[PDB]
Structure formats: C-alpha cells, structure tokens
Symmetry: D3
Subunit: 167 residues, 6 copies
C-alpha cells in the first residue's frame, strides 16, 4: 500500500534536568510539568514521522512509576509505534539518568495519539511504520491491541459526552 518509515527515522531524544520551578512538593517533580514535557517531545516525533504539523488528539495514558527529584536528569525517548490512516500512536519512555552510578531507571511511560494536519487544518495521511531493533518490535507488536482498547474507551467516552450535553 503506502510509503513506509522506520521507527528509527522519527525516534527523538530530549535530555532535561529537573529545576525547582518544575516541582510542587519539596524537591519532587510535579506531574503536570512532566506531562507538558512528554507532550512536547512526542509532538516532535510525530512531526518528523508525519512530515507535517500535528495536534494531540488524546493522551491514552501516563504511567508515573518513580518519584523524580530536583536535579535529576530526565531522558525522554519518543517513537511512533503505530500508524493509523492520519493518526499516530507515540510511545514515550522517560528515564532518570544517574551520572553517579550509570543507572537509567524507567521513571515513566506514556502513550499519546497525534493527528497530522495539512496547512488548512484538516487530517492528513501519514506514512506507515516498521520496527528494526527489539524494543521497537515490542511496541510495534503490542500496538494493535492498545488501538482496539482505545476504540472501546472512545465509545464510552462518547456516551459520557452525550450525557453531559443534556444538563
């Protein structure tokens, strides 16, 4: 069918320290700030893959696994793990890069769905995607099921939207 890109072509890195202005509780990163950064680097990966402007259609999930403290170096790695017609699933891995002991613990994991757009603001078709290394293979292989679950959630979500519209 369509043109294809490697998951490695859109793979994007971001390294960023945690500063006091990123925190809420004493020396601890606030979840909202983390979500902002996740969305930033995911948006960049989706832009590279689509070769276009994108918007966040939904945050499918953010799993906050570890507390993140002031001073911590965060490594964000985003990649496109699934391509629908005009939509992309972007998976973001966030690791704490401890330079004192070379550990790189997974601190958070997130899935977002982006939609590519043309210059007049309507959905635009995106290249397909294929893995190369084993990790890419893992996200690529587990994507279909996540996509279907997102489908069901969108059904229930639409019920809720319709209910709130009558009040």
């Amino acid at each position: 069918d369509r043109p294809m890109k490697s998951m490695s072509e859109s793979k994007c890195y971001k390294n960023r320290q945690v500063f006091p202005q990123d925190t809420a509780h004493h020396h601890t990163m606030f979840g909202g700030t983390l979500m902002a950064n996740i969305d930033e680097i995911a948006a960049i990966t989706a832009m590279k893959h689509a070769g276009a402007q994108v918007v966040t259609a939904s945050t499918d999930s953010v799993d906050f696994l570890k507390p993140i403290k002031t001073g911590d170096i965060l490594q964000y790695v985003a990649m496109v793990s699934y391509a629908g017609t005009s939509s992309m699933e972007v998976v973001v891995q966030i690791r704490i890069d401890d330079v004192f002991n070379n550990k790189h613990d997974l601190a958070a994991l997130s899935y977002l769905t982006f939609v590519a757009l043309d210059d007049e603001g309507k959905p635009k078709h995106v290249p397909g995607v294929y893995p190369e290394d084993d990790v890419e293979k893992w996200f690529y292989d587990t994507a279909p099921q996540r996509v279907e679950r997102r489908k069901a959630r969108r059904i229930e979500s639409k019920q809720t939207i319709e209910y709130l519209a009558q009040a």
Copy 2:
C-alpha cells in the same frame, strides 16, 4: 464501613484564560499546557477529598475534543468519582466559557488517578464517596468499569516494563 464524603465536598472550580505563552501553533493552546492545568486542579480536588498530600499515580486519559484558542476562558471542574482504598479517580471537565453568547462547550475531558500520602510519604486511606446531583451520579455509576479496565491496562503495562528492563 468507612467515613464518607459527598462528591460536592471536594468539587473544585478553576477559571483561567488562554494567554500567548500557553500556545504552540498560532493562537492555539498547546496540549501539554492544558495537561498541566488539568493535573493542577485535579490535585486540588483530590487533596480536599483525602484531607492530605497527594501525588498523580497515572493519567488514565485526556480526551481533547475541541481546539482552544488564545483569549478563551477555560472552566475546569474536578471531582472525585471513585474512591479505592488509598486511591482516587478524579474526573476533570474543561469547558470554554464564551461570554459573548453564553455557550459552555465541553472542550476536554480527563480521568486521573491520585494516591493520598501521609507525612512520611506512604499511601493513606481516603474517605468513601457518594453522589447527589445527576452528573455526579453519572460519573459515580460509570466508574467501576473504568477501574477494571485500568486494572487490565496495568497488567499489560507491567509486561512492557519487565520487557524494557531486559535491554
């Protein structure tokens, strides 16, 4: 069993305009900024309900329904729609308050899970919750199923975490 609070006791409002610094694309609110604000007001609702410090354990979903433009007044309403043992599901409704025509369209909808903590940082039990009005009843009545789906997602999520730990 336990002490109970009304969903109305923890119900929190936030009104905030969209300023240029909130935008990415021309005059359009960036998704990350919206997620930061969602997490802020949800955290406040969870604090009121728990009577304690909280952290975001996970973002279960953010559904971005409408574009939000510079100048728009956003109304955030957070409430606790489900109480586990020490965890809370907070549902946030975000509406655009058009003061020129009194429309209040739902622009986004989000579910987050917070965990209450005591002063030494371990999970703390939270009061139960009950609805009063019809909307509260809706979120209260649809919560159990969302909770179970979150359970399954956490299973798959744990598989992914274990896979990434061997690479």
Copy 3:
C-alpha cells in the same frame, strides 16, 4: 434604566496551589505573583459581567493580610460590586483552604476597576448589578463611598501626573 445582572452571574472561582516558582523569600509567596493571579480572576469576572473584552484601569487596593506559604491552596473569588457607566469595581477575596483542618482564612482582599471595551477598543456600557446573598449585599452597600474616594484619589493623581510632565 438599563439591563441588570445578578452579582452571582459574574461570580468566579479560581483554585490554585502555591509552587516554589511563586515564592521569593523561603517558602513564602511573592506579592507580585499574587497580584498577577488577582488580576487574572478579576478580569474573568469582569468579562462575564460585561459580556466583553476588558482592561484593568486601576488597582484600587490590595490588602495583604496573611503570609502565604508554599503548598497552600488559594481560593480566589471575584465579583462585580459596582457598575458605573462602562466601568466595573471588582472585589476579589483570597482565602487559604487548609484541607487538614477545614479552615478558610482570608489571606488577602483586593479592589480593582475594569473598563469594558468593544472590538475597536473604546469603552462600552455594562449591565447594572444587584446583590442576592448577604456578602454580596455588603460589598454592594459599601461600594458608593469607595467610588467617591477613588474619585478624589484620581484628582490628586492627575495633579501628580501634570507635575511630572514638567521635568
């Protein structure tokens, strides 16, 4: 004479925690940041009442009653307490919402004057205003005198402006 709105129609809430980036002295909210937020929520209330774009014409006063510490949940309540021809007096109450003991102490109190504007930037007439509950009645009943004092201050202010223009 003119169309009238209830003070409850424009009444606006804002809930927001104090984060480290809001502070100057150790764990203490900086006055400038508080004034920014006061102006934000007051602007929103004036927009709802006027059904129009507004600008801050003057800050009539900010009374800082209590120190506000990092972590504190602030509740801002703005309402229109007086309607001139095209101007509005907005009164903002700022309370600390202590979720550990359900106290809600008044931390600051502020009066601002907004002017409503049409799309080409000139002053626009605003609906009149009436109270319902007792608090609204209090601000409504004490407004005329504040308005007159603001009149005198504007006279002296004009003397100062004219003096500075010759130097």
Copy 4:
C-alpha cells in the same frame, strides 16, 4: 531623632522590554504582569532603604495610564517617598522609552507600602528620608495626606474583614 537617608540613595532603575509572554490581548501587556514587575523593583528600593528583608503590606494603588504594547521598553523608577516607623511608602513611575523619537511617556504610576523585617520575621525600624531634587520633593511633600487616606481605608477595610468573618 533617627538616622536619615536621601531618597536618591534607595532610588532604583529597571529597564525591561515587553515580550509576547507578557501579553494577554493581542500585542498588549497584561495588567497582572505589570503589577508583578512594579512589585519587584519597589521591593528592591525598599530593601536598599531599610537595609533589610521586606514584604509588601499593601498595594495602595496602581494607575494604568497608557496601553503598553509588545516590544515597548519600560523604565521603572522606584523610590521611598515616606518612612513611617517600620514601614515605607514606595512610589514607582513606569515610562515607555521610545528609542525612535526619544519620548518617555508616563505609562503607569503606583504606590505600595512595604514593611521591613529582621531575620526572625518581625517589623524592623527604618531610616527616615529626605528629598533633594524637585520630583523627590513633590512625592515627599504629597506623602502625608496619602498616608492619612490609607489610614481611613484601613479602617473601612477592617470593618469588611470583620463582616466576612461572620459568614
């Protein structure tokens, strides 16, 4: 009686451009941001005069005279125009510095009251103050009356505070 400082000893300048993040309406500075900066430079002047840490006790007034547009260079000049026992009246002049035609129009004028504090956080006595040039003389000569009016406002303010405490 006490030690005295010249108004010129505490006189402080601040020059700062208006950037998009300072604006609300299209290319127009938001009042809250201006108030933050006013409070910043006023705090610095009060610190120099008192030789101590200070807090903002009240904003006595902000008069917004001109619209301020993106790109504008603002010149803030703060000085101490009155010294009570442990309190200071700081007057801030804000001018637009047009480098294209060397005009320096007064865009805003503000009076704030600061209280000096020692290291354990209680009010601390401040040096007295005297003018030299004509402008300083003007603010010094018009201060007593402003002080008395602030006294009356504080009386009414206390009535309002006591009324709100019973609701």
Copy 5:
C-alpha cells in the same frame, strides 16, 4: 565622519532579585538564566544607542566570577563600548548589591555584539561613540583589540562551519 553619541546616553541599568525559579543547584543561580538577563539589558542598551531594532549577532564572552545565591539583588549595567559600521559591542557588568553591608562585588562580566536593523530586516548604520568618565574610557580604550580577536575567532569559526557542512 558620522554622528556620535556619548556612552552615557545608551547606559542602562537593571535591578533584579534572584528567585527560586532562577536557580538550578540549591539556592544558586543557573548560568543560563543569567545569560538570558544579560542579553535582555544589553539588547536594550543597543536599542537606545542605535535608535533601532537589534539582534544578538554573537556572545563574545560571559565570565562568571562569583556564585550568585537566591535572594541576591543583581545590578546590571550595560553600555556600548565600540561602534562598528552597523554593529555594536555591548559590555555588561553584573554586580551583587548587598544591602546589609553596602558591598557591590562584580559577579559577572560579559561582551556581546549586536547588529542594528531597519524595518525590513537588514543591517543599519549606528552612531559612533565616545567616553566621558574613566570606566567608559577603559572599555572604549580596550575595545579595538577585542574587536580584532573577534575577527580571528570568526575566521576559525568559519572553518568549523564549512567542515560541519560536509558530514
């Protein structure tokens, strides 16, 4: 030859405290934030001298001499120390203003090069410059040599740019 301005005509002051959001390490100002502020006040001085919009062409150096701690009052003084055809060397002095002991230690020193631009974005000629006081004389007298060294650095820099373009 051309019209001339005094170094005192473009001389600009900025006073600004260090707030927690300015820090990276515990209570210590982050270098990037300092560089942002340096560039801000230098840009303003270059605008006054050129009577035009400017852009930063290069940072010739920032020398960080002292640690700067939270709470510190920084005094920035920028001036034009050299005028090329359409370019300006701006020298910025940053001092810590200790109000407790009236010391004013030099905390940093920086040289930047700005280019003046007309309304369609091309380089525009700038007035020449002359000193009056001794400090101005010092920077004016040491400028030619810095200019020549910048010339050599720009040669090597161009070699590096050309090398990177082939990879």
Copy 6:
C-alpha cells in the same frame, strides 16, 4: 595518565520547538532564551562526562548564524571536546530540523567551559577524552588553540576586573 572517556559517552541530544514565549521580535527566537537552552544541554553533557555536579565557568562564545522562527524544531547536540584538569570545554551545535524538506541547517554554534565540583563545592578532576568519528575528531583537534586563546582572554579579563575594583 588518567582514566579516559569517549566523546560519544557524554554526547547529548535535546530536541525542542520554538514557542511564542521563546520569542522577542515577531515570531523570532530571542537570543537569551537560546543561550539558556544551550547552557542546559551543555551542563548535562558535562555532568555525564565528569560524573559530577558542574557549574558554568564561562561562555567562551555563542555564534548566532541564522534567525530561528516560532515553530522551528531545534536539535541541540552537546559534547566534551577538551578536558583540562578539572574543567571541560563543551561544544554545542544547534540545528533547525525542517521536517518538511529534511534539511538540518546549523543555526548556532557555541563553546562553554564547565568546572566539575564535588559535594562540598570545590573543583574535581575529570576523565580525559578521545574522539571516534570525524566530527568529534575535528573539535578535538581544534580545541588546544581555543584553550590557549581563552588563556589570553582571561589575562585581559583580569586586567579589566582589577581596573573596575578601583572606582
């Protein structure tokens, strides 16, 4: 002599879009903001190489080659190109990643000098460094000379510091 690290071990990437809050002139990135980000990613590279906390000792140069517009994706690549005893030269390349035509033009180039520190804040020895690929070889091979020129600049800089101390 000492332990050695590859330039590739400390090599760090950062991808970040330009948002309106990053701009000064209409849709154009402000130099100060760019310098903040440069310092951020350079600090991270120096931390990885040193295995320690670092501070910016000096910005040796920032060369601004292209205008950077709102929406642009910036790719920052930092690496250690020279190791003194306890100091590091970090070179940062900033490229615009045009996803519409796959160009990656060098928009800026910068050299900074960091000093590694132990937990009580004094300079700490750093591993040596060696290149692998051709680009790394280029910066490694051109470093000694830059180091010597920095030595001379530090001599003149010290003259200026001593002169300013007598005024």
